[PDB]
Amino acid sequence: TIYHAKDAVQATKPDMRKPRLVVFVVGETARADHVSFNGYERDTFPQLAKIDGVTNFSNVTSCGTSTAYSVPCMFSYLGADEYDVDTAKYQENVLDTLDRLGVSILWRDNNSDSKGVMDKLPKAQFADYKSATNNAICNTNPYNECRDVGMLVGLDDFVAANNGKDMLIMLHQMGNHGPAYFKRYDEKFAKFTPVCEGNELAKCEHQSLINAYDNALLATDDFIAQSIQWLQTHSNAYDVSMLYVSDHGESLGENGVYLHGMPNAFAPKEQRSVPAFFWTDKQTGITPMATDTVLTHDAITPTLLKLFDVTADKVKDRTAFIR
Ligand SMILES: [Zn+2]
Ligand SMILES: [Zn+2]
Ligand SMILES: [Zn+2]
């Protein structure tokens, strides 16, 4: 493979300082402007609003507008201005670097797959959580659809199997993917009604489409809160943190545009303006950047490296989500 960080050094090791345990929630289809913290007039993140140490970032722009385009760029060394979607999977990415330096990498997926990101690493480090084969939380809704919270089940066994190592766990959400937003959340999150149901989105009033979308965000609030709560159970033995970033936003009819995937040359703001959250325990010494920092997906790679005390020449000048 073609390297970007052959020089990378982990300055400190888990045998000499506390091991570090991080969950990176790779979000899906979530819009910054539907987040309460960014000024949305509905409380779409009530559980995160009750957790001390959550930072919300109000100015984050995605690389692109589809999962296929954005996800590889989120883990790239190139940044958005330089990213090449066709050669991305055959170049060293940030997970390759962290794995080489001894961080135990796990990717659980309730979306599709890692879009090439995990391809160079052992197959055992990727797990499909879209089916009842691996996901124990699919029977809670009329659609028999497997839920993102299912990805948390059994993570204590992974920690036990990597006892005392640094660990980075990616949880790739179904999140707010459409067009059937109403299917994305269990009935306990049907806060905003009426909702757009059925297979004909044009038959639905705009407000009912928004309602379904916002209900799906409530389920994501819950998932991120449960991810933090899970991390908190390991805080004595590990330095624990959680990063959340959505891969792109979503058009909900603005200017006659729906869904996502619009080429960047024409993409409206709602497809690229994404939420991002960072949480850490007080013991870690990790400090968030200012909430209004002008940020992009280019911040992800340097954040992940910084979380594990890794430096790489190519990202020296790059702003992260953390100091
Ligand atoms: Zn990018
Ligand atoms: Zn999509
Ligand atoms: Zn996506």
Side-chain angles (χ1 to χ4, degrees):
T1 191
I2 294 306
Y3 292 80
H4 288 305
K6 190 70 236 208
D7 62 286
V9 169
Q10 191 173 36
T12 68
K13 289 282 175 193
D15 67 348
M16 285 298 292
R17 46 77 181 155
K18 269 185 80 170
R20 294 163 181 211
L21 170 60
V22 177
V23 168
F24 178 16
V25 178
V26 183
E28 183 56 65
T29 301
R31 288 168 61 143
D33 69 349
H34 281 240
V35 181
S36 51
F37 304 123
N38 294 328
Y40 194 51
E41 291 197 329
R42 282 171 164 185
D43 191 359
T44 44
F45 289 83
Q47 301 187 243
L48 292 189
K50 294 289 169 187
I51 296 172
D52 193 17
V54 175
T55 298
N56 174 79
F57 295 98
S58 60
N59 192 349
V60 188
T61 302
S62 66
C63 191
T65 62
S66 66
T67 319
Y69 190 89
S70 288
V71 169
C73 187
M74 290 165 86
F75 297 86
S76 177
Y77 279 99
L78 291 175
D81 202 56
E82 187 65 11
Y83 169 71
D84 176 59
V85 70
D86 281 31
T87 54
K89 102 140 197 149
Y90 306 104
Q91 291 174 51
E92 184 190 6
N93 68 51
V94 69
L95 302 187
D96 297 312
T97 308
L98 292 171
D99 197 272
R100 182 173 68 256
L101 299 174
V103 183
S104 188
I105 305 304
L106 177 64
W107 184 296
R108 296 188 168 181
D109 207 298
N110 191 31
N111 178 299
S112 46
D113 64 29
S114 76
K115 308 298 181 184
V117 170
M118 291 294 294
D119 288 6
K120 304 181 216 64
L121 295 170
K123 287 177 286 298
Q125 298 173 224
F126 178 90
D128 182 15
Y129 270 71
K130 298 194 298 301
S131 84
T133 303
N134 293 325
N135 196 324
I137 311 185
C138 319
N139 67 341
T140 56
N141 59 83
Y143 317 108
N144 212 26
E145 182 173 308
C146 298
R147 301 305 196 200
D148 295 328
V149 284
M151 295 188 283
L152 299 171
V153 176
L155 291 177
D156 287 352
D157 297 323
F158 174 78
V159 167
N162 291 276
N163 173 60
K165 296 181 166 164
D166 289 337
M167 283 169 279
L168 176 58
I169 301 167
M170 270 57 60
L171 307 178
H172 193 196
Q173 286 196 270
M174 185 60 77
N176 267 64
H177 211 280
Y181 309 110
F182 74 97
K183 295 188 187 197
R184 297 297 99 80
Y185 56 88
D186 290 348
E187 261 252 285
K188 70 177 170 194
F189 300 114
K191 190 183 179 212
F192 306 107
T193 66
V195 301
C196 181
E197 296 185 296
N199 299 319
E200 312 195 57
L201 278 75
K203 276 189 159 55
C204 292
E205 291 293 306
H206 177 69
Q207 183 66 248
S208 81
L209 194 66
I210 298 302
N211 290 347
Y213 187 89
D214 287 343
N215 292 339
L217 290 169
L218 289 173
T220 283
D221 175 57
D222 179 81
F223 173 62
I224 301 164
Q226 292 203 53
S227 301
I228 292 169
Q229 288 152 4
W230 175 76
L231 287 163
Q232 289 173 311
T233 71
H234 293 288
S235 66
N236 186 237
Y238 299 85
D239 279 348
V240 294
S241 306
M242 187 288 304
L243 177 68
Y244 169 89
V245 192
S246 187
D247 67 336
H248 51 74
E250 189 70 334
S251 292
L252 298 164
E254 296 80 7
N255 315 300
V257 182
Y258 294 85
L259 315 180
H260 52 267
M262 187 63 71
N264 283 350
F266 313 116
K269 67 185 184 291
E270 71 272 2
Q271 289 189 33
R272 290 184 68 187
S273 180
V274 290
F277 315 119
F278 180 75
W279 173 85
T280 196
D281 179 69
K282 282 197 185 304
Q283 298 165 105
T284 66
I286 302 296
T287 308
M289 290 289 282
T291 60
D292 65 347
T293 305
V294 178
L295 285 160
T296 71
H297 283 168
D298 297 2
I300 296 164
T301 286
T303 302
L304 295 177
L305 294 176
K306 280 176 157 172
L307 285 166
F308 294 99
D309 207 10
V310 176
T311 49
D313 288 352
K314 278 207 188 198
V315 303
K316 187 220 155 197
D317 288 339
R318 297 212 188 147
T319 306
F321 287 104
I322 59 172
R323 298 182 184 281

